[PDB]
Scaffold this active site. Structure first.
Site, mmCIF file in Angstrom:
data_model
loop_
_atom_site.group_PDB
_atom_site.id
_atom_site.type_symbol
_atom_site.label_atom_id
_atom_site.label_comp_id
_atom_site.label_asym_id
_atom_site.label_seq_id
_atom_site.Cartn_x
_atom_site.Cartn_y
_atom_site.Cartn_z
ATOM 1 N N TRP B 321 34.911 5.950 7.132
ATOM 2 C CA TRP B 321 34.912 6.423 5.742
ATOM 3 C C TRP B 321 33.609 6.077 5.061
ATOM 4 O O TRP B 321 33.256 6.599 4.066
ATOM 5 C CB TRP B 321 36.045 5.787 4.950
ATOM 6 C CG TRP B 321 35.850 4.345 4.627
ATOM 7 C CD1 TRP B 321 35.482 3.291 5.467
ATOM 8 C CD2 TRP B 321 36.061 3.781 3.337
ATOM 9 N NE1 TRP B 321 35.404 2.137 4.729
ATOM 10 C CE2 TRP B 321 35.726 2.425 3.411
ATOM 11 C CE3 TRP B 321 36.353 4.340 2.090
ATOM 12 C CZ2 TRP B 321 35.831 1.596 2.284
ATOM 13 C CZ3 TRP B 321 36.456 3.495 0.988
ATOM 14 C CH2 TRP B 321 36.158 2.149 1.091
ATOM 15 N N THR B 385 42.453 -3.108 11.637
ATOM 16 C CA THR B 385 42.103 -1.884 10.883
ATOM 17 C C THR B 385 42.389 -0.602 11.655
ATOM 18 O O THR B 385 42.796 0.446 11.109
ATOM 19 C CB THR B 385 40.600 -1.962 10.577
ATOM 20 O OG1 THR B 385 39.912 -2.262 11.815
ATOM 21 C CG2 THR B 385 40.233 -3.097 9.627
ATOM 22 N N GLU B 450 39.548 -5.518 3.446
ATOM 23 C CA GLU B 450 40.134 -5.673 4.752
ATOM 24 C C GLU B 450 40.624 -7.102 5.002
ATOM 25 O O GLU B 450 41.305 -7.342 5.994
ATOM 26 C CB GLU B 450 39.126 -5.290 5.835
ATOM 27 C CG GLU B 450 38.739 -3.857 5.775
ATOM 28 C CD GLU B 450 37.713 -3.488 6.816
ATOM 29 O OE1 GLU B 450 36.847 -4.348 7.136
ATOM 30 O OE2 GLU B 450 37.820 -2.391 7.330
ATOM 31 N N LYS B 516 37.188 -8.862 0.200
ATOM 32 C CA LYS B 516 36.042 -8.607 1.033
ATOM 33 C C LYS B 516 35.075 -7.687 0.295
ATOM 34 O O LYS B 516 33.882 -7.770 0.487
ATOM 35 C CB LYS B 516 36.490 -7.964 2.347
ATOM 36 C CG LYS B 516 35.372 -7.789 3.330
ATOM 37 C CD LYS B 516 35.813 -7.160 4.649
ATOM 38 C CE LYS B 516 34.764 -7.078 5.711
ATOM 39 N NZ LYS B 516 35.358 -6.736 7.044
ATOM 40 N N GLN B 517 35.600 -6.726 -0.504
ATOM 41 C CA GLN B 517 34.821 -5.648 -1.017
ATOM 42 C C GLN B 517 35.728 -4.910 -2.002
ATOM 43 O O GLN B 517 36.934 -5.203 -2.145
ATOM 44 C CB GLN B 517 34.360 -4.647 0.081
ATOM 45 C CG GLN B 517 35.487 -4.014 0.845
ATOM 46 C CD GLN B 517 34.997 -3.334 2.082
ATOM 47 O OE1 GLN B 517 34.696 -3.924 3.137
ATOM 48 N NE2 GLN B 517 34.735 -2.058 1.927
ATOM 49 N N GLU B 594 23.918 -5.396 6.581
ATOM 50 C CA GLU B 594 25.246 -5.128 6.059
ATOM 51 C C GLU B 594 25.653 -6.082 4.925
ATOM 52 O O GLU B 594 26.310 -5.695 3.964
ATOM 53 C CB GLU B 594 26.228 -5.200 7.218
ATOM 54 C CG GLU B 594 27.667 -4.996 6.874
ATOM 55 C CD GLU B 594 28.617 -5.191 8.074
ATOM 56 O OE1 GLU B 594 28.162 -5.746 9.150
ATOM 57 O OE2 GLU B 594 29.811 -4.819 7.948
HETATM 58 O O1 LIG Z 1 34.885 -2.324 14.575
HETATM 59 C C1 LIG Z 1 36.017 -3.169 14.314
HETATM 60 C C2 LIG Z 1 36.155 -3.653 12.907
HETATM 61 O O2 LIG Z 1 35.046 -4.461 12.586
HETATM 62 C C3 LIG Z 1 34.995 -4.991 11.270
HETATM 63 O O3 LIG Z 1 36.306 -5.861 11.117
HETATM 64 C C4 LIG Z 1 36.588 -7.116 11.780
HETATM 65 C C5 LIG Z 1 37.646 -7.795 10.928
HETATM 66 O O4 LIG Z 1 36.971 -8.163 9.708
HETATM 67 C C6 LIG Z 1 37.851 -8.888 8.782
HETATM 68 O O5 LIG Z 1 37.052 -9.191 7.683
HETATM 69 C C7 LIG Z 1 39.134 -8.094 8.350
HETATM 70 O O6 LIG Z 1 40.090 -8.881 7.614
HETATM 71 C C8 LIG Z 1 39.901 -7.495 9.533
HETATM 72 O O7 LIG Z 1 40.954 -6.637 8.948
HETATM 73 C C9 LIG Z 1 38.858 -6.812 10.520
HETATM 74 O O8 LIG Z 1 39.454 -6.332 11.765
HETATM 75 C C10 LIG Z 1 35.118 -3.898 10.193
HETATM 76 O O9 LIG Z 1 35.149 -4.477 8.864
HETATM 77 C C11 LIG Z 1 36.213 -3.071 10.478
HETATM 78 O O10 LIG Z 1 36.180 -2.000 9.541
HETATM 79 C C12 LIG Z 1 36.164 -2.537 11.889
HETATM 80 O O11 LIG Z 1 37.225 -1.658 12.110
#
Ligand SMILES: OC[C@H]1O[C@H](OC[C@H]2O[C@@H](O)[C@H](O)[C@@H](O)[C@@H]2O)[C@H](O)[C@@H](O)[C@@H]1O
Ligand SMILES: OC[C@H]1O[C@H](OC[C@H]2O[C@@H](O)[C@H](O)[C@@H](O)[C@@H]2O)[C@H](O)[C@@H](O)[C@@H]1O
EC number: 3.2.1.216
Lengths: 659, 659
Positions: B321, B385, B450, B516-517, B594
Site C-alpha cells: 500500500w 501482517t 502494525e 508505529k505510525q 526508512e
Molecule cells: O516484509 C515483512 C514485514 O516486515 C515489516 O514488519 C515486521 C514486523 O514489524 C513490527 O513492527 C509489527 O508489529 C509486525 O506486525 C511486523 O510483522 C513491515 O512493517 C511489514 O509491513 C512487512 O509485512
C-alpha cells in the site's frame, strides 16, 4: 603483546584486521573482529569449481559458530561492549574473546577445532553477572552463497536422560560435486529437566537458527557450549546422517572429555618445540610458525597443506611443491608422521601423475604443478606454470627419499617410496634430450623463478632431475633391485652452467634479469649439489640483489639466511631471517602474507621456509645423505643467548646451541 | 553542494557512503564510491526465493558497467588519483565521476539507465591526456553469487561497415525460476578499420572480460562508450538472443541518438516540477524526491514500485500500500500515466486477489499485503501482517477511484476501475460482522499501526472499508449498473469509535499505547472521513507524541505536516515537514532511509509522503470527491518566499503560492 604462547589483540579494529585460524588439519576457522562470530570456515579435501582460476577450489563453508547474544532485551554488538579482547592460545589452538556488557555481565568465549575429532568444533561460553539479567542466545546456520540447494532441519534426540536439540543444514557445492552437512547442538550443565527450551526459526531462505532464554541472578556464572560437526560426501558417503551422529556422540562425550582429548593431542604436538632465549618477539613468531604448520597438517592421513593451509581460499587450496620443499622438511624433522601424511597424499595420486605424463607425451609419473582431489593437474589454464613448470616431479621424489633417510623405514620404501622414485625417474629419463656433445638438457620449462617462462636448462629444474635420478638409483640398491643404468648416465651429464662472472646461470637465456624467487641458490640448499663454500657465496651475493621488494613471495630470504648460517655469517643470516617474514606481517596477530606488504595471509609456505632457516640454519641440523639427522657448523643471531630444539628425528633428540 | 538540479560528492569516503541510483523504472544502478564501478544492479519484475523472508525477492544482478582502466600498465586506484568527484544530474539521471590520474590525464565517466529503452544502459568515458600515453580498458562481467549455472560468451557481429564485439553472460536465479541475459559492447568514434582490437579472457568460473589498448596523443581527448542490455525470462521468452539483439540495435543507433531520446523523455518528466524560492536545501531535497519517484516508475506499463524502488533489495522488491497511498497520489497529480501503471499492476493481479480471498474464506478480491510477480500473497510467514493486515484491499480501491476522479476516464472505469471496485467491495461485504446493535465490525486484524496485532475495529482499516464500499457504489451509479444496496448500509454502520476525551480510538483495545505510525490520523488525510477541524486537531494532539523516535518508518510526520498546513499552522506544518525526512538522511547524497538514523536507503515511500506534504499540504491541492483537482486553504513555511507547482491534473495547471 609478546607472550611466548599467546597472541593478543585489544579492541579489534575491523578496518585493519586479519583474523587468525584455529584448525585440526581438517577444519579451519578464521576469526572475525566481531564478538561471537567467525569470518570464514574451510573444510579440507572438499573441492569444486568456484571463482578464481576456473579450476577446483576450496569452498567457503558454514560459519557454524555464529551466535547472537542479547541481555535484558538488547543485542550485544561491537558498539555497546567494552574492554573487548581476543587471544589465541597456541598451546591448544583455543581462540578466546572476552568483553564487558554495560553493568550486567562479563562474557568469555573460547572455540576449538577439536584436535582428536577432525570434523568437530566446540565453543564454550561463560557469562559472569554483576546484575540480574536475562540472556537470549541464538546460534545461526546461514548457508553461504558459495553453496546451493540448502535444506534447514531441526529435531530433538531424546531418551530418559537427555534432550539433544540438533540444528542441521545440508547443501551442495556449486556444480553439485560435493554434499555438505553441518549439525550443531547446545550442551548445558543443568540436565534435561532444567535446561532451557530450544526454539527453532526458519525465517530466511538461507538462514535458520536455534535459540533460548535464561535468567541469571547477579553474582553467578552460567555456562553453555556449542558443538558442531561439519562433513561432506568427499569424506563419507552419507554426510547428513554422519553429521548428526557425530554431534550426538560429541554431546554424550561432553565438554570435559572432549577438551581433555583435545589437550592430550596438542600436548603431544608441542613435545617438538623451539625455544629462544634473549628475543621474546622471535620466540613468539617461531611458535606462531610451528602452531600454524601443526594446525594445517594431520598425522595418520593422506592430507597435504595448501600454501595457505586452512586459513582460507589461498591458491584454491591446491597442493604445490610448497609442501615437499618448504613445509615438509621441518615437519619431517620434528614429527615424521606428519611428513608421512604429506607424502601419502602423493603416493595415493601416483596413478594420476602417470596419467598426466601419458597425456603430455612422457613416461613414468609426472606430478602436476597444482594438485587437489584426484591428483590430476589443476593449475589455472591462464598460468603457463601448469603446462611447463616441471620441477615438481623431482620435488616429490626428493621428499620421498628424505622420508626414508630420516625414518629408515625400508618397508615404506618398498611399498610407497620406490613406486614414487621409480616412476619419477622414468619421467626424467624420458624428459631429457641428449645433444651432440653428450650432455643432457631439459628444454622449454617455467623456472622456479617463475618470471622466466619457456626457457631451457633451468638450474633448479635441472638439479631436481639430477637428484631424482640419483635417489631412485640409491633406492633400487637399498631394495636389491636393478635400476636402468641410464638413470646415473643421465644424472651425471645433465647441464648446470656458470656465467663468466663464475655465477651459476639460472637458465640458458639468463644474463642479469631480476628473478621472482630463489632458484639457482636452491642448488646449494636444499639440493646440496653445490657444496663449495666460495661458489655458494658467489651465487648468494649475485642473486640476493635480483629479488625485487614487490610481488616476490616468501620462498627466498629464508634460504639466503640458512646458507649464511652455514657459512657462519651471523649478521647476514639474521638480516635475511627477519627479511623473510617481518615485511609480510598483518595485524593484529602477526599473521604472514605471501609477499612484502601483501594482504593474503596465512602463507604457511613462508613459515615453512623460515622454520628451515631456524632448524637447519641456526640449529645446523641436516638430513644426512647416508641416513638420519646430523649437525653441521652454524651461528646464532648475536642477540639470541640460547636456541633449544626438541623432538628431532626418530630418536627425539634435543639440540642446544649457544654462543 | 546545494545546486537545485545536481547532487554532488567530493572524494567519496567508502567508510561512510550510501550510493545514489539511476533508473528507468526497469533497471536500477546504485553507485559505488570506487571509480568506474557500480555497487548493485536490480532488474524490476524478476523475483525468486533469495535470502530475507524465505519468499520471492529481487535479486542482485550483473554489475555490468564495471571497468578497469590502466595507463602504460598502471591501474587506477584510490592512491593514484586526485580531484575525484561524483555527481548525479537529476535533470537526466546521469551519474558522473571525474578524476585526475597523477598529473598525466583527466577522466570523466557518465552512465545512464536509458529512459526510452527499458533494458539498456550506457556509460560514456572521456580521457584527456597531457602527454602521449597508452590506456588499457577492461569491462568485467562478474556473475554475482546470487546467480548460478552461468555461461560466459564472446563474439563478433560484423558486416562491411562494423565489428560489434559482444561480451555476454547468461545465468539463473537461485531456484532456476528466471534466466538472466546480459550483453555488452564498446562503441568507438573512429570506425571499423581504426578501432582497437578487442580481446576476451575467461580466467575465472564467475568472471570474464573484454579489453583493449589504445594510444592517445598529448593534448587529445579519447572517448568511448559501453553499452549493456540486461533482460530476463520474466520479460521475454528468449533473453539470451534478445540481450544480444538489443545491444546490437543500440550500437547501430549510436550514442548521440540514444542520448537524445533519453534527454527527450527526461525533459517530459520534468514538465511537472516543484520550485521553491528562499530555501535552496528544500528545493534540492524536493527535486531529489521527485527524481526518485520518476526514476522508480514507468508510464505505459503494469509496473509498481517497491518501498525502496530500484535502489536495492529493500522489502524484497515487493509492492505494498506504499504505492497506492504514499507514492501514487503525487504521481497521479503530476503525471497521471504513471499512476495508471501503478493501478494497472493491481488490475492485472485481480484474479490472484480473488484467489487469496477464496483461500481465506471471503468473497470478491482480497489484495495481498505484499505482492510480486503473480499477485499472490508474498509476505514472509513470520510477519503477521501477511495474514491479518487487511486494509490493503481498501487502499487499492481508493487509488482506483482516485484515478477516475482525476482523469475522468469513464472507459477505464468500465474496463478496469469497476472490476477492482466491485470485487474489493464484495470482499468487505463478506469481511464485516454485524452485531446485536446493527453495527458492522471488522475483527482480528493487524492495524496500519502494525504494533497493534490481532485487535478489533482498527480505525484506519475500518475507514478504508467504508471508502471502498462508498466508492464502489458511486462507481456503479456512474456506469449505470446495479450495486448491492447492502454496500451503503454497511458503510454507514461500520464502527469508528471515540475515547472519553473525544479522540478517535485506534482500535478496541487502544488506550495510550505507543504506535508505529499514523493510523487514526489517516482518517483526516487521506480518507477525509474526519473533516471537522477541532476533531482533526484533537486527534493530532493525542497521537502526535505516540510515535517513538526509534524504529518508526517515514509514514507519519508528512501526514502531520499536511494536516497542520490544512489547519493553517505554518510553524507546526514546517516542523513536521523537516522531521519527516531530515533525521532519516544518509551521506553523501542525502538519500532517505526508512527510519530516523536508519541505514537502508532509498525509502521511496517516505519521499511519496513528503511530496504529499508539499503538494497537498503547502500547495493546498486536493482530489475533489466530485472529480478533478481543487485547492483548499494552506500556509507556506515562513522562510519559503514562493512555491510553484507545475503540470497538475489533466489540464496541466500551474499553481503559485506566496505569503
Ligand atoms: O516484509 C515483512 C514485514 O516486515 C515489516 O514488519 C515486521 C514486523 O514489524 C513490527 O513492527 C509489527 O508489529 C509486525 O506486525 C511486523 O510483522 C513491515 O512493517 C511489514 O509491513 C512487512 O509485512
Ligand atoms: O595458481 C596459478 C599460478 O599462480 C601464481 O602465478 C601466476 C603467474 O605469475 C607470474 O609471476 C609468472 O611469471 C607466471 O609463470 C605465473 O603463471 C603462482 O606463482 C603459480 O605457481 C600458480 O601456478
Amino acid at each position: 603483546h609478546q607472550d611466548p604462547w599467546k597472541l593478543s589483540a585489544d579492541k579489534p579494529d575491523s578496518n585493519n584486521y586479519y583474523g587468525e585460524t584455529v584448525a585440526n588439519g581438517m577444519i579451519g576457522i578464521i576469526s572475525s573482529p566481531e564478538p561471537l562470530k567467525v569470518k570464514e570456515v574451510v573444510l579440507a579435501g572438499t573441492y569444486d569449481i568456484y571463482k578464481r582460476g576456473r579450476v577446483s577450489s576450496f569452498i567457503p563453508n558454514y560459519n557454524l559458530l555464529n551466535m547472537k547474544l542479547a541481555f535484558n532485551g538488547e543485542s550485544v554488538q561491537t558498539y555497546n561492549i567494552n574492554n573487548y579482547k581476543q587471544e589465541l592460545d597456541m598451546r591448544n589452538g583455543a581462540f578466546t574473546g572476552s568483553f564487558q556488557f554495560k553493568d550486567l555481565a562479563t562474557v568469555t568465549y573460547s572455540y576449538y577445532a577439536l584436535r582428536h575429532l577432525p570434523h568437530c568444533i566446540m565453543m564454550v561460553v561463560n557469562i559472569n553477572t554483576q546484575k540480574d539479567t536475562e540472556i537470549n542466545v541464538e546460534n545461526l546456520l546461514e548457508t553461504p552463497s558459495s553453496l546451493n540447494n540448502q535444506q534447514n532441519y531441526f529435531q530433538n534426540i531424546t531418551n530418559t536422560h537427555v534432550n539433544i536439540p540438533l540444528l542441521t543444514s545440508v547443501a551442495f557445492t556449486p556444480t553439485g560435486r560435493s554434499k555438505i552437512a553441518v549439525s550443531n547442538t547446545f550442551l548445558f550443565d543443568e540436565g534435561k529437566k532444567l535446561q532451557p527450551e530450544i526454539l527453532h526459526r526458519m525465517n530466511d531462505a538461507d538462514m535458520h537458527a536455534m535459540s533460548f532464554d535464561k535468567k541469571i541472578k547477579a553474582g553467578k556464572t552460567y555456562s553453555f557450549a556449542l558443538i558442531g560437526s561439519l562433513i561432506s560426501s568427499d569424506h563419507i558417503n552419507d554426510p547428513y546422517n554422519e553429521a548428526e551422529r557425530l554431534t550426538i556422540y560429541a554431546a554424550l562425550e561432553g565438554k570435559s572429555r572432549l577438551l581433555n582429548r583435545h589437550m592430550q593431542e596438542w600436548n603431544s604436538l608441542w613435545q617438538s618445540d623451539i625455544q629462544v632465549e634473549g628475543d621474546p618477539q622471535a620466540q613468539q613468531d617461531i611458535r606462531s610458525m610451528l602452531y600454524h604448520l601443526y594446525s594445517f597438517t594431520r598425522k595418520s592421513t593422506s592430507l597435504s597443506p595448501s600454501p595457505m593451509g586452512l586459513s582460507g581460499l589461498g591458491y584454491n587450496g591446491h597442493v604445490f611443491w610448497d609442501t615437499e620443499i618448504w613445509m615438509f622438511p621441518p615437519m619431517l624433522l620434528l614429527h615424521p608422521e606428519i611428513a608421512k601424511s604429506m607424502i601419502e597424499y602423493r603416493y595415493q595420486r601416483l596413478d594420476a601423475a602417470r596419467k598426466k605424463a601419458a597425456i603430455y607425451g612422457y613416461d613414468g609419473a609426472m606430478f602436476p604443478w597444482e594438485s587437489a582431489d584426484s591428483g590430476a593437474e589443476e593449475t589455472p589454464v591462464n598460468a603457463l606454470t601448469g603446462a611447463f613448470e616441471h620441477h615438481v616431479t623431482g620435488d616429490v621424489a626428493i621428499a620421498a627419499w628424505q622420508y626414508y633417510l630420516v625414518t629408515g623405514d625400508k618397508e615404506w620404501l618398498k611399498e610407497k617410496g620406490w613406486p614414487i622414485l621409480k616412476a619419477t625417474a622414468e619421467f626424467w629419463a624420458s624428459r631429457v634430450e641428449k645433444n651432440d656433445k653428450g650432455e643432457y638438457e631439459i628444454k622449454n620449462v617455467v623456472a622456479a623463478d617463475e618470471w622466466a617462462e619457456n626457457i631451457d636448462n633451468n638450474a633448479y629444474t635441472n638439479g631436481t632431475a639430477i637428484r631424482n635420478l640419483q635417489y631412485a638409483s640409491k633406492c633400487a640398491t637399498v631394495l636389491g633391485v636393478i635400476a636402468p643404468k641410464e638413470w646415473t648416465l643421465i644424472a651425471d651429464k645433465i647441464l648446470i652452467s656458470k656465467m663468466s662472472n663464475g655465477v651459476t646461470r639460472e637458465h640458458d637465456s639468463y644474463t642479469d634479469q631480476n628473478i621472482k624467487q630463489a632458484d639457482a641458490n636452491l642448488l646449494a640448499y636444499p639440493l646440496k649439489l653445490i657444496t663449495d663454500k666460495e661458489q655458494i657465496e658467489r651465487d648468494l651475493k649475485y642473486y640476493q640483489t635480483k629479488i625485487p621488494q614487490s610481488d616476490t613471495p616468501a620462498m627466498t630470504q629464508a634460504i639466503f639466511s640458512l646458507l649464511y648460517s652455514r657459512l657462519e655469517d651471523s649478521d647476514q643470516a639474521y638480516h635475511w631471517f627477519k627479511d623473510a617474514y617481518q615485511p609480510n606481517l598483518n595485524p593484529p596477530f602477526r599473521v604472514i602474507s605471501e609477499c612484502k606488504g601483501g594482504t593474503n595471509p596465512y602463507f604457511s609456505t613462508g613459515a615453512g621456509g623460515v622454520l628451515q632457516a631456524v632448524i637447519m640454519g641456526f640449529g645446523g641440523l641436516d638430513i644426512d645423505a647416508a641416513g638420519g639427522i646430523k649437525q653441521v657448523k652454524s651461528v646464532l643471531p648475536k642477540n639470541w643467548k640460547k636456541l633449544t630444539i626438541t623432538g628431532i628425528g626418530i630418536e627425539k633428540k634435543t639440540f642446544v646451541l649457544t654462543h
